[PDB]
Amino acid sequence: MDWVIPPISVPENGKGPFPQRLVQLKSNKDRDTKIFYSITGPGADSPPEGVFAVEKETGWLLLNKPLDREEIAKYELFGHAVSENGASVEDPMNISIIVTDQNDHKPKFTQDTFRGSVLEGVLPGTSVMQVTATDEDDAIYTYNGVVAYSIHSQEPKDPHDLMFTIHRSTGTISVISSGLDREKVPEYTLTIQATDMDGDGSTTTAVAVVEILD
């Protein structure tokens, strides 16, 4: 056979129990003799030692503890298949291990209180300010790092409830109604939220304090 072996992918933060089986290594030369399996590489016999191991006679590749993609995202190991002798019956097997992402991190606003301001006179649709939240998880290939922005509430509610809105992706807060008026209401506190999985995940909260100018 001359197929190139593909990588295996292992989701991070797996549930117990450990150790657990990933895949079974096997040379088909064991229709002939007994075979002894082993592994090498960082993650196995060099730092970080003992993250993976293999059952010498079964060939089972074992993971000994939960992985964290944000700590190490990939491993490069090698499977070795030996006879009673000690002598190779295969060239070593490429064991590329890709740690795939889970939503093990909540999103975080870059500050607890954002300040901005706007002229009472501006047209509906004008930008006021921009808020940011970060999420350590993969936002490129998965939604676990993708933040959706929302306004939870506005104090005060004068002259009404919906003076501002927020762009769900960019975090840019804009004016959406007439009626801003410094003399009447000089300042608003907006309770803002960021939610991962583009809305379907967990939510964290902060405020944006918007000063009205004339």
Binding site for a copy of itself (CB under 8 A): 1-11, 13-15, 23-29, 79, 81, 90-91, 93, 100-104, 106, 139-144, 146, 197, 200-202
Of 58-77, binders to Ca ion (CB under 5 A) are 69
* DSSP state at residue 182: T
Using CB under 5 A, pick the residue from 105, 108, 168, 182 that binds Ca ion. 105
Alpha-carbon gap, residue 156 to 158, rounded angstroms: 5
User: In terms of CB distance, is 69 or 180 closer to a copy of itself?
Assistant: 69
Residue 1 is a binding residue for Ni ion (CB under 5 A): yes
The b/e string for 126-148 (b: 16+ C-beta within 10 A; e otherwise) is eebbebebebbbbbeeebbbbbb
Residue 14 binding partner per list Ca ion, Ni ion, a copy of itself, none, with a CB distance cut-off of 5 to 8 Å that depends on partner kind:
a copy of itself
User: Which of 54, 49, 61, 53 is CA-nearest to residue 24?
Assistant: 61
User: In terms of CB distance, is 101 or 210 closer to Ca ion?
Assistant: 101
Using CB under 5 A, pick the residue from 144, 154, 193, 195 that binds Ca ion. 144
CB of 25 to a copy of itself, least distance (A): 7
CB neighbour list of residue 162: distance below 8 Å, 6 or more residues apart = 154, 176, 177
Site string for Ni ion, 51-80 (x = CB under 5 A): -------------------x----------
**CA geometry: angle 92, 93, 94, nearest 5 deg:** 120
Tokens of 93: 């097997």
Residue 15 binding partner per list Ni ion, a copy of itself, Ca ion, none, with a CB distance cut-off of 5 to 8 Å that depends on partner kind:
a copy of itself
Alpha-carbon gap, residue 154 to 186, rounded angstroms: 13
Q: List contacts with Ni ion (CB under 5 A).
A: 1, 70
